[model samples]
Target: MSPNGNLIRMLVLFFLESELHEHAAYLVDSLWESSQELLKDWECMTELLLEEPVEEAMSDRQESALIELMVCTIRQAAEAHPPVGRGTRVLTAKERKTQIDDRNKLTEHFIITLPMLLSKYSADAEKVANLLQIPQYFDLEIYSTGRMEKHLDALLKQIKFVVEKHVESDVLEACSKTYSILCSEEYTIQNRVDIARSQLIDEFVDRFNHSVEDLLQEEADDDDIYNVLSTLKRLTSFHNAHDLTKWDLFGNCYRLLKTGIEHGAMPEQIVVQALQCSHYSILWQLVKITDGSPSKEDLLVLRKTVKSFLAVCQQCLSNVNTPVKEQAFMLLCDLLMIFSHQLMTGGREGLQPLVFNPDTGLQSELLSFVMDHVFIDQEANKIEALHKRRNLLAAFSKLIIYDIVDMHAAADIFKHYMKYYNDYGDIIKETLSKT
Candidate 1:
């Protein structure tokens, strides 16, 4: 037999023998480092393992074993040649060039091979996708060569293929994997995965809206609602890394929250999830708009969303349940901080009227809620009370010191605070002094 045939035969034997299957991965890893010629034989062995009939002939267990072996071997080969970097020990120019060339070759090889493996084994595509570790590959390529757009595009296509094919049957799991890649810390910090992020967002929004509509038409149990909303929340993490306000996701999410609130009755958990999704979606939009100049229409939308959100909070705060009240109050506090910042910076003029105007009464109502529910509610422990008090007072300080709102309005609240709690009055006064 030829040398290549002998190499292929040995690999096939390991896979064919159940007991030897456990050793196949390491053997392939060793062979990968043996020589370039033997590496070609390993590549040929991979094709045989993935052939339809070969996989079809195996029992489910055997097929899984073979897939594991394939995954391990592919990962080993992909990482065989490491890229040159600053942390490396001294090397001659000749050695460094060789390292670069070898690393590029390995990367290019996987960039071509992994998608084919995933497509061929579509039944196990998610497993293959996870093991492919596209995020690490992307980071490596970007680190060494500083460009991998085409590579990323190809990987994203493979991801989309897997997601689109399986989303109907395994929507949660598939979207979970896709979300991990899109929002992975590596991708987020580099800001190099926007293409993938955008595509996933498009698909996610479609699925999310469809799920919401289904829930509205059909009475979904708590588990069903929870799963859909949980997936939606996970997918929204993509927004934290990328500005997706252009998709009008904020409006869609806001409407979802409105539906949930008006749906007559829901599990407290679902309500909280809906509130959270709405908060994140709108907050992401706010972050994007504040990061740069926003249009007149954008500012108008921002004001409307903030007002609607505060209204939602007021409704929740009126709830008899303590958990619901606390969640709503926390949301209110965050929105108040965002509004205060917007006012102080003069970024969004529209917010001033909604937040500051005495006639609007939002400012007074907000302070009253804090003083009554947050400060005067002595049921809370000292530690918990201190934290809530600090947040509320700091917000008040911003409004008072920055002159973002009417001073007399804030002074009236402070006077009320003093009349009710003289012992803590010094704390509030000191907070104002620092501001």
Candidate 2:
């Protein structure tokens, strides 16, 4: 209720209300060196600052009062009693919880204030950067999906505002760093990735095509021109490689193949690369190299390579359209036949390769692919989901009746179609009789 810097605060409040501003500033200076905190501090301190736009002569004295409050309050906020030394004695979970809890009290409100800070002072580089760094301080990962929407929409909107208003690039780039920290830092949300990224994708494509088309026209590229090309090359290029946020666009076939959601025709460029580089040739080559009576260890090594290749086919089967899956599914069948020989025979060339190849593990492995990957629900209505079931059932039968896949896979897969199986029950029974 009372100021810790003691009875002088009463006099400080008196002079603060009076227009003699010098003494008012000086008293807050004294309180900064001596006092503790807020309500008495912030509620009294933050709001009590003179609100009008006073001139430099009077404004000069007004600042010292605000300055002391900021410093004194900041000191208390930072020196909070947090847990010590994880290296020596690890904290109990509750200890860790309280420590983070201590910091959140001050910081979380800063997160809430960020949008207002940006709106009022977005033109000032110092003010915008100061606000943008708030989430990074508390660790953006600490917030919830809903809480983060506050941060994301503000950041996303400010970028639009700053871009539209013709602001300085320094402020723009500060927002860029804010964008990076929020989305790609240790904590990221897919809602951010999907919404933020989906918005950027077409714009980036439009900008990139603008750059590339002129370059291709032999308009004579310059340093900035090539830099644009070079930077964007990594953004959309083939070897953008294993990062989680890798782009989907031109020169990369995966955007079309992986996005069966869109009905775009794929570039044959991708298919040409796929057929050449996929090297079913190498798959067959690995076979002959380790063919007859290969060493026990090398046989397993050969088998492992083939086994992983089957997983690649598995992913393609799961995601790609029916056409690619046709090749992928056919490749999966060959892998089963190969896995059978290499694992059991130590990869020796031979034998009756048998219908269903049950001795070779062909039946068991393919059964898992059918049961786990392929047999899941694709709801009753939509055309895309509808075809997913109808065609896969035909392939499932091709596997079952022709003896490529077997009944062990059948009974398990049939369990998935409880609601829908009635449609195919007659066909399934007919196939059962054929068997």
Candidate 3:
């Protein structure tokens, strides 16, 4: 592209980007422009943005900024693009192909340089991290296109690099906030709750092995403390309210739960507060209040909430007191029943597919090895007491069943479920015979 063309493109880009960033800056600047004026027909503009073919590849930050600005513009654009009960019209076949190409190019550029951006501006790193996971903007389109997993994988890589090698505590905070936003439904980084479980499980295992024991043992570090608590709370809330249609809410909440576990447990006070918060409780109460009579939108909200809660249960099991862990495990089992019932009544949408990885077996083996070494020491019971080993097994069983079902193999679902039954059937029968 010639300098003149580049200038022209910059002009168009800035006109749109400046307009939205201007709004974002408004609150910070304490300006009171009508949000309505700023967001007029924002959806149309989004359609236009998606419609416009890529003339050139912008730098990763530039691409991310542009996408973020546009999403903000649309959000500020009023009810023009209200996220619920409606769907964006897919591009035509020709348009779709071109759109995918453009999206791939933009995403590639954005993903490639995300880590460098976080690394360079450690000061503004948190803000940039938040921007990276902004849901209304880039995530919505990605969710709509069914490419969330790809984006998540890319994000996971960037985050792992930042946390493991960067060595800046601030960067960790940024990563935490980014994951928090990504897992939130309001931000809608994803649409499924399972992502939360998997991510958290990965994070928890990592932190359990790598971070200082004291960091995990104490809650004195305010930033780390609150980040862990907040992430778990958000996850629990999402699981309790998970709705397949509201992927943004469910997915983001799920991811946050994962981040919380990965970061390490907070103080008991923080965990209790999180449990008491309206977000988590409301979802539970709402389920009881509605009693399966919720409107479609309401049902969706509850569904997302339940899924988020389930993620919370899995993550928090490591840190909960024994009695509480037992209660939570039971609650988790209840959720599994609810989840399966809901799916049977409706269908799976917010769940992630089960992955059969050899690495998982290794994780189990490592956990077992550690447990065997410590089991004889009664002092370790405090840790072991809070553990939900059987619940974990059951959850995995349920997930395996769902994974098969998700793959459209009803027979496989039955096959997998029966395999678990076969493994445990003898024990179950003996118990039944005793009863």
Candidate 4:
């Protein structure tokens, strides 16, 4: 037999025969010491190993035993971290060297255990699903505290580079990954949201303020102006996502408006962009609720939240260029229309109107607001006319095919609008008559 085959046989025999708990410690130490370089070269290793018929020889029981061994190894690695209350101290010179060794060993253990589990469970979907829940065994909250700090530090250094140099797609990708890591719910990973909210946002805000002062000192070229605009757009989106999660929509909006007022200036376009993102997020949440019926009080809170979002968007639209605000405004209108239609017509009980009760007066107010801003406004009129034509054509086709309750109801609504217009003929006749 080849040397590689002999080594594989030995490894399989040792893993299967050994008592996992007793041998786990030594295996962990060996794996950890070698795992750093192994992990770094894993892609090459995976390619080399693909030619070997390793999986065919391993029985289900053997695979299960190997998984158990890996799990134990990982649990030990996580446990090796010093608990939060343990002060950062080198008790003695000798102990300091030992501590560093132990820390390196822990990193090795992590590298080995993760790969081992992946190898053992890759073919067993059920086992993989069950084993993935093992993060609950570790102190995720404590781990997150450290992980967040490290990622945030890396992200800040990268942002400083972006300010000094032109932004690249790779840099943006890194930023997005760090952003996801910060907001993720995995406690086993780091919690960087607080650090990101405090440090990165402050850094960008200071940089922006400095840029503005630089432009005031001297005129900037179109390229320089564009760079500033691009940077502001990136930071605004990042800050808006962070703030709306950390502070709710109400608080986030208040801060933006307060900053504008205290500076004795109007809300910027970026502030309006943040408001639009936040409003859409809120609308998504309300639309998803399908459990027990909403109470009158609950409905009132939803109405107020939605109204506040729209009010902010309307204020921004009035102040900014129409082209700039048009997309966000139209999105707001479409979402409001969908939500209103759902409330009037959705759920298991079928097409029931929700806005008729005196207590739910906000629905009427909402309907009026939608009609005024989305139906009557000139840009809104174009949107509504197109929307009405598209829906009416779709409804007419469905009604002609067969009678479905919801389809019929939709068609009836479209038909009534045509009747209200006295069944207006095609545009050619109407236009020629004007002559």
Candidate 5:
């Protein structure tokens, strides 16, 4: 063998040793027995391996081993190829086609072999889950062709089965991998989404419910809570296609937020995640109810939820130890805006009690919080700070214009604005002049 051929063989041996030991040796034996003549020619050996239909040529285990070798080869070539601007020789069109052909063949091999190998390795659940990453090989052309969806569909079902039947740790791992495949940017071509929508959404809901139940039982750790909330956030992307409004997801998500906030023992991270989940859930509801008015029950529940959330934010603003005070404050501003819109529109009469009661003084406290924390002197990015300042001012303006703030609360806001007279004096004067 030439030096290049010897180098290729060594590289193959190296990857085989690292990735697959017994299977690697089995593949080497199979290659030697099948064609010793091509063994000296690494290019011919690779071409033969790529062309061979592993389904007919070998057992499932052998096919898995061959795939590992093929993927390693493709990865090595990609890393070894010279950069375009360098003075090295560029690949000819034919050479480029050969590389493309190798990649295409590896993808096709994965599409054909992954499902079978996953089942064959079922007892070895980690190995089965590892195969779920085959979609990482999907490129734009392969995705556009839509050939990978069928195989991905099969793999998704298998993964869902694992998530349902396995132990909690394994189920979490499988679910994580499943989410990666469904939400991956490369696999989200138009045609592939239907497959994911049909197969993954129900399983996702099931897993989410399971996680929430674990939390309710006080059995979940910070990682479990974080992953569950992360999955919930990702699931919101499928709201339109999957009819999430009708799916009962929001109630469970709200329960999580309530539990996290009220559970004094939960970690700060989990509590923050709960806040984030509720923020997303509320935003989704806002989008859905934009064109059409919310039903009475939804409006009432939303009003109550926002009230509770604001109460938490008020406490968060005071708790100097609270790590996510800024986020909590931001969500408070958003809820105020949502509530203001509800009042502006023809929402029912019951919302007023939930938003602005004399006993709670929630409105006054909110104005004080924003003016003290959000709108005060800051030394960050000017443009970004200005943008945030505008949003805070708008939220406050809406509250004042819509009469959400009582007369006394409005007077307090005026006094707070005067305190920042040196910075915003002219703007406040212009606003007062307009009024």
Candidate 6:
């Protein structure tokens, strides 16, 4: 038909217009193509590369309208999908095929439909199976555009949703026990003890991981950072029996700790709490996930964790801040005590154990960092014009000979350090020579 006439008609387009309306108008509206050459159709113009994430002063109206459209699409979807576990007892061939399509939609529907559920349901649905996909997998729409609040709110609501929704009245019996003071307060624990068939643990763990992640993406230094750290430390203690490795919990916490490792205007409290969160995560994982011997995979994760832990310790030691320096020394000693058993039975290859790792294997990395701190400290030190070197002298020694533990350094390190701490004083010289 009239391709030139169509081009003239496209001139009336509104959303595509921006800047001052000039004759570059057609070019501007385009990805610089009329986008409809020869009408091979959708492929011809490379259609929506023209979308190119357009924005403007007037776009707020269009943006809000776009948002409303999605909202109702979700709502319209909820209206038609059937209720889980309560439909026609037998589904036909067509019914079974349609059921898969319908239930797959429920994954999105359930996440929204619960807290937002005025009153609704879906048929013979794989309700739990579908909902479990949520925590175990990623949802691109929610995560990418930063509807994280929407995402987290959906998660917590499921806990209370399960409490009310699943406890059927089919004679399924379901807390109360107290002294007079507790009874006066009406201490009846929800009339049932074990509703763990639907775990609250997994939901809270998801909440914690994503919350920290969202916090890291917006990882600010002042005001909110302290608030986020305090909440992490507080929330971390409340939940347990969760794994250390999966769900990005260790990675999340370690990355948050990384924020504090570098010097900045970040306050002392943030650094301490960041380290505290890391410490709590390590202990809780041991208590929950590590009763028996750790698996081959499990041990490898611990190796990276220990390596990252030592890496931070070096950062903590070199800072001018005196309070955190000691925490660094003590944490290294604590970790060493936990894993030093592997160190004692050295076998290079076959008995690889946990400590043998490419990223963190060398004792050389930790010792080298320590010596760098010692050299810097010796120049200016901390305590006085003359006495400044004394504190520096003592701090690094305390770290080196921490808890009467053996220090492992390369032969070159001992050869290098053999003259260094000896020049400072006897306590370190003796401690260094003894092992």
TM-score of 5: 0.45
Error of 2 at 342 (Å): 34
Q: In candidate 6, which residue pairs get closer than 3 Å at backbone N, Cα or C atoms, i.e. clash? A: 82-122, 82-123, 83-121, 83-122, 83-123, 84-122, 85-124, 175-191, 383-388, 384-388
User: Per-residue CA lDDT of candidate 5, range 1-435, in tens?
Assistant: 345444444545554457554443344444543433343243433433444453334344443444455443434333334223321357788667756765666556555565566666555555554455455554435544755657666766666565544443443444554445555465355446545555666777787778778777765687677657655644553442234554566577556655655654555554555565556665666566545656777667766766666666666555444445655666666676566536445655544543433234666666666667555664567888678667766665666675666646666667866776768889988999987
Q: Residue by residue across 65-149, what tens digits does model 1's lDDT show? A: 5455545444444454322231124656865665465556545555556566666665565455444543343234343254555
Which window of 10 residues has the lowest lDDT sum in candidate 1? 80-89
Candidate 2 clash figure, as a count = 2
* Between candidates 5 and 6, the TM-score winner: 5
Better of 1 and 2 by lDDT: 1
User: Top lDDT: which candidate number?
Assistant: 1
Report the lDDT tens digits of candidate 6 across residue range 141-234: 3322344446334444443344233322110111011011111322231112122312443554565565666656664646456455544543
Off by over 4 Å in 2: 1-102, 139-151, 160-173, 184-188, 215-435
- Could you tell me which 10 consecutive residues in candidate 5 have the lowest summed lDDT? 78-87
**In every candidate, how many clashes are there?**
0, 2, 33, 1, 0, 10
Q: Sum up the clashes in candidate 3.
A: 33
Distance from true location, Cα of 64 in model 3, Å: 9.1
Give the Å shift of residue 55 in candidate 2: 7.2
Evaluated with TM-score, which candidate comes out highest?
A: 1
Model 3 lDDT tens row, 59-118:
545544444554444333322233343224544685455445544434443444444444
Task: For candidate 2, list the clashing residue pairs, or say none.
Answer: 38-41, 38-42
For model 4, state the Cα shift of residue 301 in Å.
3.6
lDDT of 2 by residue, 29-88 (tens): 444434433312433332333233333222333334443433334333443322132112
Error of 4 at 294 (Å): 8.6
